Enzyme design. Structure first.
Site, short mmCIF file in Angstrom:
data_model
loop_
_atom_site.label_atom_id
_atom_site.label_comp_id
_atom_site.label_asym_id
_atom_site.label_seq_id
_atom_site.Cartn_x
_atom_site.Cartn_y
_atom_site.Cartn_z
CG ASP A 225 -6.30 -2.02 1.46
OD1 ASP A 225 -6.56 -1.01 2.14
OD2 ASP A 225 -5.13 -2.34 1.14
CG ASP B 70 -2.13 0.91 1.02
OD1 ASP B 70 -2.92 0.66 0.09
OD2 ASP B 70 -2.29 1.86 1.81
CB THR C 41 -3.69 5.16 -0.64
OG1 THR C 41 -3.19 3.85 -0.91
CG2 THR C 41 -4.84 5.07 0.35
CB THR C 42 -0.83 4.34 -5.11
OG1 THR C 42 -0.82 3.43 -4.00
CG2 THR C 42 0.60 4.61 -5.55
N1 LIG Z 1 -7.41 -6.98 -13.26
C1 LIG Z 1 -7.38 -5.67 -13.59
N2 LIG Z 1 -7.84 -5.24 -14.78
C2 LIG Z 1 -7.82 -3.94 -15.12
N3 LIG Z 1 -7.35 -2.96 -14.32
C3 LIG Z 1 -6.86 -3.25 -13.09
C4 LIG Z 1 -6.85 -4.66 -12.65
N4 LIG Z 1 -6.31 -4.66 -11.41
C5 LIG Z 1 -6.01 -3.38 -11.09
N5 LIG Z 1 -6.34 -2.54 -12.09
C6 LIG Z 1 -6.14 -1.07 -12.09
O1 LIG Z 1 -4.93 -0.73 -11.41
C7 LIG Z 1 -5.12 0.44 -10.60
C8 LIG Z 1 -4.35 0.30 -9.30
O2 LIG Z 1 -4.96 -0.70 -8.49
P1 LIG Z 1 -4.25 -1.25 -7.15
O3 LIG Z 1 -2.76 -1.02 -7.28
O4 LIG Z 1 -4.75 -2.66 -6.92
O5 LIG Z 1 -4.83 -0.34 -5.95
P2 LIG Z 1 -4.74 1.27 -5.93
O6 LIG Z 1 -5.84 1.72 -6.87
O7 LIG Z 1 -4.97 1.63 -4.49
O8 LIG Z 1 -3.34 1.58 -6.43
C9 LIG Z 1 -6.62 0.58 -10.37
O9 LIG Z 1 -7.04 1.92 -10.67
C10 LIG Z 1 -7.28 -0.40 -11.33
O10 LIG Z 1 -8.13 0.31 -12.24
#
Ligand SMILES: Nc1ncnc2c1ncn2[C@@H]1O[C@H](COP(=O)(O)OP(=O)(O)O)[C@@H](O)[C@H]1O
Ligand SMILES: Nc1ncnc2c1ncn2[C@@H]1O[C@H](COP(=O)(O)OP(=O)(O)O)[C@@H](O)[C@H]1O
Ligand SMILES: Nc1ncnc2c1ncn2[C@@H]1O[C@H](COP(=O)(O)OP(=O)(O)O)[C@@H](O)[C@H]1O
Ligand SMILES: [Mg+2]
Ligand SMILES: [Mg+2]
Ligand SMILES: [Mg+2]
Ligand SMILES: [Mg+2]
Ligand SMILES: [Mg+2]
Lengths: 50, 525, 521, 479, 121, 49, 72
Positions: D347, D13, D46-47
């Site tokens: 989360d 995170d 948060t990122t």
């Molecule tokens: N399986 C997936 N398919 C398409 N987009 C994804 C998938 N997993 C995550 N994302 C995209 O990656 C971005 C980052 O997600 P994540 O790193 O899990 O948490 P956070 O949004 O807190 O950084 C999200 O905005 C999401 O739209």
């Protein structure tokens, strides 16, 4: 140690300006100098293959 | 147990970095250098002040001199200083503009590097855009005529180039002096000049408006005797190299005197040779002899009795300058001093300054001489240096104009036209390489923005207005009104620049950008 | 000086020129540092620390900056103390008074450099201040009979106070919130009764004002959460081991059965006290002390909500809102005056639980919930809201508003000039310097706005001299507009206090020509 | 991350990494507070908010170099934020709480970027059931995350995690011999069972051996009477709280309780009484005259369990009055993986709570980002010059998230951004980056979605932080 | 830029350091695995001979300031507490798996695919 | 510091307190000097006050 | 200032505000040091030294004092 920049793409000059003190790492500099004195072309390919 | 092995010598003191952070640091350093060397651009820019290692104060605005005495230690800054020095040695005009363009190009390429473009493709696109701009700039070039009668374009260009320094209150006469010196030392049969012939000397005291051109040779020496006549109306120059001493071979010679007869013969021969050389100096018909080394007492007395002034200690280029201007020959001895090897002098009279004990002899009213002297007068020490630098810049500009025999329209229209041409050519490049051309076109417009910022108006608004006026009409001579004259047309404002200089600046900036984008490593202790 | 030393080793002594020059340099530095945050379009400041665990904060007013920096120059220490006194008094005019003092000292420097006696300058400054205060007292608007006009003036004052901070983006709601919170006091000086609770998270639009009351406490166990109708009663007793006395009593028995009987008697006494507490017929007990397990279970077995851990401020707020009376002893149920409420529940604001109180009868106090991103933004919003509430209470107690912006300063400068244009002597130089300072005071704001300050100052002076004593400065366009039409109105007490403090500081600093420092420890 | 004391922490995170980084610059010390506020409000993204804020602050460099007043920039940024919020609200998709597949997809979407990418199919349905058991589909407006206790234990792998719908204690029992009772009645006891000591300074004066014997006789009689009074109610499992003053349990009382076949657990703190009373459904007892009446309760099986060799654990499954509380038993080999799984579960719970509170769904990936960028690019052509340039600079900063997503997947970011911009302006508007196929297709077919409230709050907080940065431009050192 | 007040790496340097540390930890107890291996010896500062070769005790009485070393030590301790036999074979297998995955990571392969393949295998 | 036209004196304490007064007695008292004549004059001023 | 070091160790650089302020302060000091000896009723100064041979000169000209002071 005097403050002079040495920019060179050839691996021979890079190996010469590195000043290595390891007894086993000096074998690459020797073959690099030999290749540069022979034909002067593939100086890094021999090191990568070794 | 993984024991660490010693590889590089003194590994516990040096530091190694990857590459992306080094490139980012180099880009940031170039941007900082370009921002620092930005206020000294345009007629509204101010001057800088530098401090030497001992405690000397130097105030100038040439750009190359400011960077040469900056004392940096970041390699990239030293590279920029060396590039500015090379530009000043080649062209002479525009020393900070090239580094500003390089910094702007690096700042524009930083965005493409952060996006996800290979640096090789960015360098190739920048080189292609620079080549396109160079090929397009020669299309809107105008050729001018060079003659001994019409000297209007040269004077206009010298006034435009010298319109940003502090000597702009007298650059009207400085431009005429420079063009007169150029017409004197032109050498049209070979299309080259010689800076060693033009003597640039300055002295403190007086006013800035006292700068005049002298078609002769001036020296910093006086006469050998205070009772000698100062001014003369008709005299001949007799250049000599051997001193006024009896002859002496450079080998090891020993004179043996074993009786009174030998000593008497030597004492008689001394005065005999003295009188012989004195008569030989007079029999040649000259009225003012010029030696090289010191004199003596009997020789000086005989010269004063025979009415013949002379100048001592002139072993430097003064003898060569006198032989070139007056046209007289140089003899190694006294027996070869003939009437044909004499120079004609018009007016040889020394001048006196203030309450000091400094006297300088100046020769004027000569024939068709090929060497002139520039006398600089002022009230400050840095003022003379600034005037000399401005005169050298004007001379280099006129030399480049004579070599190129054609001028262009700069100020703030050539860069805009080049950016427009690059943007138009980028519309037919759908092979991913269109992002580098747009960046080069956006970074090329950093000169009008900087000019509008230094003037005191809106940069982006004025740039957009100039671009619209250039794309609506058909005249690539619309720049930035820095003097607030009303009309934005640079054709009637007498704004003349250089073409080969701008081309070399663009090529050097592109080469430096390509070289910086290639380096991505550093190994400093 | 004299070769024979008098002071100890390490004690300096500045004479008349050195001390005055040092004080003038310090005043100029303070003025140049504080002039950046003066106009409505000012910026913020970062006040980081190095010994207090690196305290980071963002402020806009100069009083907090002067209190957090803490220099060693006595000339600046006097200004810091004056700003602190003004903040403790009214709390709205510190940068203005310190800029006026800096300008007065800068003018006095050039006056002394022109070989002028300080007594004449002091007399001229006193006469100019008297004329300015007389003109300000003569030019005043008294509004108290009309209600709509008074409310409009209060709203305009609140908006002008909030526009100088970071609340210019949400001034359309914060002004109304402050107006509604001020009217809840029923014309009282209970500024400490308004609780401001700041919660991390959310934007500035979620900062809503609750018409009732909110408490961040927890009720007892095995008790009903929500109550349809209840009667809150505030008590002041100790339910946790009621035996705190100065009596040196001890149990000197000879059997465990006696100790057990004593413990049973104590438990029975506690139960009887709890029953006497509920003898008033209440169902929402609130104690300011701690509650153990026996009284908690006794209140829960009867269906009465018991709230423990309450400070004095919360008790006073609950007594002023619900109209209750702090009672003890619990022996006279006929005289206690219980509260009244028809809505009791718990809400969820963010990640915490707070008791929601609504449907009260009186409701003199009210809670304000602040929502922001970082802690510095929330602190700045709380400080701006507190300053707005303070200036609103001040202008309500005064019941007289004066147009600000730049009209009062120009009127005072014109009055000083008219007074100086009648008296001869060397006293006209001090009045001229005072008029120049009064004219340069709005010039700093005009320069910070981003327009031609000299042209606007000349236009305002011409408008004030031609007979128009209502013109001012427009910040929405940069021209000259009417102050009675836009809504730029300040206060009279604040301006008078600022002028008097500036005059006092100038008279104090100008009457100093010797500095004798002692040996530092 | 390695602290100065020697603690090695591994987390994914952004908020935890920013908090453990410990920066010193105010521009960097505000981002950690921004991330903390974002995690407190929403919980996820948060990122992304930090990336958006950094992109906006980097794009503001061009506007600052061009010569634009910060107030005009702030007004244009506020207008762009309002336009983006309106567009996201108009493009929102309605969804109710009856669709169980949507909740499972939203729970499994937030469990693919960490180490629990291979165990999401076991943690998502468990979290969904735990959420559905706590809240009610009646008229619940929020989710109380404080009613769920997370129990961490070292041992085993991650697939051994289960869900216990009862009370789980980490400590053991104070009785030996009886450790498994089928039918038991749990009874909370808050009073001590030792020697009678009053609150005042009590002392016993003895001057004869008769009194010496009578004191012990009366003490034993009182202990026996208390034990008989406790046994009279018919209790089996006794819970005594922690007492710092007097002793809560002596040796004679413990021996009598063991002889009466009563399990004694004297290890209850003063902060988990409400949780136990809400889970097992009991009432605190502080007097001996109330434990006999209604203050009792009932339960089902209450026996302790043993692990592979790392301590004991209590498990109370089955109660007469089931409440709205539940607990999760997280296992694992290393403690870092345990805390990582706990953070992932938290989360997921926050994402589910936000989805329940908002009842709005939207496509995931980089489709909303490119959609907002295109809508802002198509809107700048209806303003003046400075406003148009500010809107264009605001729209160009939104292309960092899709570029980063395309770079992290292993493809060309510029080509992917160009394809996404060309496909979003010809009909379809729900196209995202697919990491499984390796191109550009419909993102709604991969069963990946994200809530709208989280993104809205992140964008609002980023815009507020950007507007708050331009207002500060001075650093003064204080004491 | 980026004031962190400490030290940091890049991307491949940390992986190479972890691989080297795992290889060193594996080679530390690589002479007492099979039935033909001999025992070791552990001496402290005051002079206390500790002749043992179980692996878990040697890893516990090693005191290494490396994160991967501490992870391997706690894994061996958990294996010995849950079972008691096979405390060094698991560490050797983990080190070999890390060394094999390092070559795949160096070949421009995403770690997620390698982790999925390892889990499937 | 004598007469109606006399100015005040600014005294600096050891801890850092600023005290601006016009009475000569307190000024001489808050001067922690070292000469015997200065101390005698300070004592005389204190006795006079 | 940029975090990346550019100049060598032991080299300061003043921008626009500090440089102009220092220049104005130095100019004011130079003008005030000699302002006492301008009018016809001016006095004289003492220019003593310690690095030479204890030279002591008393003059009224401003250029001599400015040359003997040795400013920085
Ligand atoms: N399986 C997936 N398919 C398409 N987009 C994804 C998938 N997993 C995550 N994302 C995209 O990656 C971005 C980052 O997600 P994540 O790193 O899990 O948490 P956070 O949004 O807190 O950084 C999200 O905005 C999401 O739209
Ligand atoms: N009178 C003028 N009209 C238009 N442009 C000018 C004028 N004078 C100078 N400039 C522009 O200002 C720039 C800076 O020129 P200058 O400061 O004289 O030398 P340098 O190019 O070395 O800085 C030039 O590129 C030129 O185009
Ligand atoms: N809307 C406005 N229009 C014109 N001037 C304003 C406005 N708001 C505030 N001011 C000016 O700001 C000054 C007060 O600013 P502030 O820094 O908040 O308090 P202080 O008086 O302590 O400086 C007032 O003198 C007033 O003239
Ligand atoms: Mg080759
Ligand atoms: Mg030039
Ligand atoms: Mg105020
Ligand atoms: Mg997420
Ligand atoms: Mg074995």
């Amino acid at each position: 140690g005097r403050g002079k920049a040495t920019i060179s793409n050839d691996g021979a000059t890079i190996l010469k300006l590195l000043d290595v003190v390891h007894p086993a790492a000096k074998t690459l500099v020797d073959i690099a100098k030999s290749q540069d004195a022979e034909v002067g072309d593939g100086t890094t390919s021999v090191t990568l293959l070794a | 147990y993984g024991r660490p092995f010693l590889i590089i010598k003194d590994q516990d003191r040096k530091s190694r970095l990857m590459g992306l952070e080094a490139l980012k640091s180099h880009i940031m350093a170039a941007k900082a250098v370009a921002n620092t060397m930005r206020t000294s651009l345009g007629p509204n820019g101010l001057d800088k002040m530098m401090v030497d290692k001992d405690g000397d104060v130097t105030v100038t605005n040439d750009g190359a001199t400011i960077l040469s005495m900056m004392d940096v230690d970041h390699q990239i800054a030293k590279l920029m200083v060396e590039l500015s020095k090379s530009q000043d040695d080649e062209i002479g005009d525009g020393t900070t503009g090239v580094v500003v363009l390089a910094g702007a190009l690096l700042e524009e390429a930083e965005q493409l590097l952060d996006r996800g473009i290979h640096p090789i493709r960015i360098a190739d696109g920048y080189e292609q855009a620079a080549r396109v701009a160079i090929e397009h700039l020669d299309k809107i070039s105008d050729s001018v005529l060079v003659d001994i009668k019409d000297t209007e374009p040269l004077i206009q260009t010298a006034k435009t180039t010298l319109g940003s320094k502090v000597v702009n209150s007298c650059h009207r006469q400085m431009a005429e002096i420079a063009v007169n010196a150029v017409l004197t030392v032109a050498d049209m049969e070979r299309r080259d000049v010689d800076f060693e012939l033009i003597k640039v000397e300055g002295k403190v005291g007086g006013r800035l408006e006292d700068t005049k051109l002298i078609k002769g040779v001036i020296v910093d020496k006086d006469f050998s005797h205070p009772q000698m006549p100062k001014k003369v109306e008709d005299a001949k120059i007799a250049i000599l190299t051997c001193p006024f001493e009896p002859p002496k071979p450079k080998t090891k010679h020993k004179l043996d005197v074993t009786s009174v007869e030998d000593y008497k013969a030597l004492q008689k021969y001394e005065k005999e040779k003295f009188e012989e050389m004195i008569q030989q100096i007079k029999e040649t018909g000259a009225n003012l002899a010029i030696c090289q080394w010191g004199f003596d007492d009997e020789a000086n007395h005989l010269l004063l009795q025979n009415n013949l002034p002379a100048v001592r200690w002139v072993g430097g280029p003064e003898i060569e300058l006198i032989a070139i201007a007056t046209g007289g020959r140089i003899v190694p001895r006294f027996s070869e001093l003939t009437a044909e090897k004499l120079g004609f002098a018009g007016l040889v009279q020394e001048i006196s300054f203030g309450t000091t004990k400094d006297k300088m002899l100046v020769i004027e009213q000569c024939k068709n001489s090929r060497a002139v002297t520039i006398f600089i007068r002022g009230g400050n020490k840095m003022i003379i240096e600034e005037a000399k630098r401005s005169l050298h810049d004007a001379l280099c500009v006129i030399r480049n104009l004579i070599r190129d025999n054609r001028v262009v329209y700069g100020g703030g229209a050539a860069e805009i036209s080049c950016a427009l041409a690059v943007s138009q050519e980028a519309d037919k490049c759908p092979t991913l390489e269109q992002y580098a051309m747009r960046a080069f076109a956006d970074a090329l417009e950093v000169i009008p923005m900087a000019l509008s910022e230094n003037s005191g108006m809106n940069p982006i608004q004025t740039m957009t207005e100039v671009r619209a006026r250039q794309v609506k009409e058909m005249n690539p001579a619309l720049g930035i009104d820095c003097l607030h004259k009303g009309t934005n047309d640079m054709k009637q404002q007498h704004v003349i620049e250089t073409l080969i200089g701008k081309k070399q600046q663009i090529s050097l900036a592109t080469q430096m950008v390509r070289m910086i984008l290639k380096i991505d490593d550093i190994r400093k202790p | 000086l004299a070769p024979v030393n008098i002071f100890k080793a390490g004690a300096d002594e500045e004479r008349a020129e050195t001390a005055r020059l040092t004080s003038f340099i310090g005043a100029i530095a303070i003025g140049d540092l504080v002039k950046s945050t003066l106009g409505p379009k000012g910026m913020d400041k970062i006040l980081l620390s190095s010994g207090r665990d690196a305290s980071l904060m963002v402020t806009n007013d100069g009083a907090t900056i002067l209190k957090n920096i803490g220099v060693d120059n006595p000339a600046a220490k006097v200004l810091v103390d004056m700003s602190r006194v003004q903040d403790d008094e009214v709390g709205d005019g510190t940068t203005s008074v310190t800029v006026l003092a800096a300008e007065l000292l800068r003018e006095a420097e050039s006056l002394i450099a022109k070989k002028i006696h300080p007594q004449t300058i002091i007399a001229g400054w006193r006469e100019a201040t008297k004329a300015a205060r007389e003109a300000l007292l003569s030019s005043a608007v008294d509004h108290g009979s009309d209600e709509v006009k008074f409310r409009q003036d209060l709203m305009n004052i609140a908006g002008t106070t909030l526009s100088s901070k970071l609340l210019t983006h949400h001034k359309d709601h914060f002004t109304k919130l402050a107006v509604e919170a001020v009217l809840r006091l029923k014309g009282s000086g209970n500024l400490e009764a308004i609780h401001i609770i700041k919660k991390l998270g959310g934007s500035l639009a979620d900062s809503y004002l609750d018409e009732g009351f909110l408490l961040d406490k927890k009720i007892g166990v095995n008790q009903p959460k929500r109550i349809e109708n209840a009667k809150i009663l505030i008590a002041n007793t100790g339910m946790d081991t009621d035996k705190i006395k100065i009596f040196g009593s001890r149990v000197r028995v000879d059997s465990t059965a006696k100790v057990a009987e004593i413990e049973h008697a104590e438990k029975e006494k506690m139960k009887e006290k709890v029953e006497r507490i509920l003898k008033h017929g209440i169902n929402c007990f609130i104690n300011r002390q701690l509650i153990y397990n026996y009284p908690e279970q006794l209140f829960g077995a009867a269906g009465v909500m018991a709230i423990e851990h309450a400070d004095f401020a919360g008790v006073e707020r609950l007594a002023l809102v619900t109209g209750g009376e702090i009672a003890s002893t619990f022996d006279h149920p006929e005289l206690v005056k219980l509260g009244s409420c028809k809505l009791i529940e718990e809400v969820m604001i963010g990640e915490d639980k707070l008791i929601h109180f609504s449907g009260v009868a009186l409701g003199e106090a009210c809670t304000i919930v602040l929502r922001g991103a970082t802690q510095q933004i929330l602190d700045e919003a709380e400080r701006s809201l507190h300053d707005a509430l303070c200036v609103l209470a001040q202008t309500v107690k005064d019941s007289r508003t004066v147009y600000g912006g730049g009209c009062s300063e120009m009127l005072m400068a014109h009055a000083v000039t008219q007074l100086a244009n009648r008296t001869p002597g060397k006293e006209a130089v001090a009045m001229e310097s005072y008029a120049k300072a009064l004219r340069m005071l709005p010039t700093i704001i005009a320069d910070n706005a981003g327009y031609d300050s000299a042209d606007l100052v000349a236009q305002l002076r011409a408008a004030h001299s031609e007979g128009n004593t209502t013109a001012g400065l427009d910040m929405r366009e940069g021209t000259i507009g009417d102050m009675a039409i836009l809504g730029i109105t300040e206060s009279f007490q604040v301006k008078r206090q600022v002028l008097l403090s500036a005059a006092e500081a100038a008279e104090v600093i100008l009457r100093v020509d010797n500095i004798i420092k002692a040996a530092p420890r | 991350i390695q602290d100065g004391k020697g603690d090695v922490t591994i987390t994914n995170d952004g908020a935890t990494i920013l908090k453990q980084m410990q920066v010193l610059h105010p521009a960097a010390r505000m981002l950690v507070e921004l991330s903390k506020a974002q995690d407190i409000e929403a919980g996820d993204g948060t990122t992304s908010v930090v990336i958006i804020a950094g992109s906006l602050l980097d794009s503001c460099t061009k506007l600052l170099q061009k010569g634009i007043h910060p107030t005009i920039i702030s007004e244009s940024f506020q207008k762009a934020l309002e336009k983006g919020i309106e567009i996201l609200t108009d493009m929102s998709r309605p969804v109710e709480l009856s669709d169980r597949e949507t909740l499972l997809n939203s729970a499994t979407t937030s469990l693919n970027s960490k180490v629990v990418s291979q165990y999401s199919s076991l943690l998502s349905p468990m979290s969904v059931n735990a959420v559905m058991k706590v809240i009610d589909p009646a008229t619940a407006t929020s989710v109380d995350l404080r009613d769920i206790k997370i129990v961490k234990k070292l041992g085993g792998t991650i697939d051994d995690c289960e869900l216990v719908e009862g009370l789980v204690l980490t400590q053991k029992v104070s009785n030996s011999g009886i450790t498994r009772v089928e039918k038991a009645k749990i009874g909370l006891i808050q009073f001590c069972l030792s020697a009678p000591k009053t609150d005042m300074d009590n002392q016993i004066v003895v001057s004869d051996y008769a009194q010496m014997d009578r004191v012990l006789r009366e003490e034993r009689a009182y202990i026996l009477n208390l034990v008989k009074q406790i046994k009279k109610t018919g209790c089996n499992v006794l819970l005594i709280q922690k007492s710092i003053l007097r002793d809560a349990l002596s040796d004679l009382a413990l021996h009598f309780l063991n002889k009466m076949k009563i399990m004694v657990i004297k290890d209850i703190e003063r902060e988990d009484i409400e949780f136990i009373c809400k889970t097992i459904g009991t009432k605190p007892v502080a007097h001996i005259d109330q434990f006999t009446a209604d203050m009792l309760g009932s339960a089902e099986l209450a026996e302790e369990v043993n692990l592979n060799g790392s301590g004991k654990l209590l498990k109370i499954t089955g109660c007469a009055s089931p409440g709205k509380t539940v607990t999760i038993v997280v296992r694992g080999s290393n403690k870092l993986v345990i805390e990582e799984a706990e953070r992932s579960i938290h989360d997921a719970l926050c994402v589910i709570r936000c989805l329940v509170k908002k009842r709005a769904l939207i496509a995931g990936g980089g489709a909303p980002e490119i959609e907002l960028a295109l809508r802002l690019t198509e809107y700048s052509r209806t303003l003046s010059g400075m406003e148009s340039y500010c809107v264009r600079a605001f729209a160009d900063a939104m292309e960092v998230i899709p570029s980063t997503l395309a770079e992290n997947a292993g493809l060309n970011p510029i080509s992917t951004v160009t394809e996404l911009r060309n496909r979003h302006a010809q009909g379809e508007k729900t196209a995202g980056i697919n990491v499984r196929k390796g191109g550009i297709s419909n993102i709604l077919e991969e069963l990946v979605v994200q809530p709208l409230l989280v993104s809205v709050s992140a964008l609002t907080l980023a815009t507020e932080t950007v507007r708050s940065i331009l207002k500060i431009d001075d650093v003064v050192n204080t004491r | 830029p980026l004031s962190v007040f400490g030290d940091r790496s890049t991307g491949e340097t940390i992986r190479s350091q972890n691989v080297m540390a795992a290889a060193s930890i594996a080679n530390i107890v690589k002479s007492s695995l099979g039935p033909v291996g001999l025992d070791k010896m552990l001496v402290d500062d005051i002079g206390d001979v500790t002749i043992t070769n179980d692996g878990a005790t040697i890893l516990k009485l090693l005191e290494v300031e490396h994160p991967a070393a501490k992870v391997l030590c706690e894994l061996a301790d958990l294996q010995d507490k849950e079972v008691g036999d096979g405390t060094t074979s698991v560490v050797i297998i983990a080190a070999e798996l890390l060394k094999n995955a390092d070559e795949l990571v160096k070949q421009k392969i995403h770690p997620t695919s390698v982790i999925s393949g390892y889990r499937l295998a």
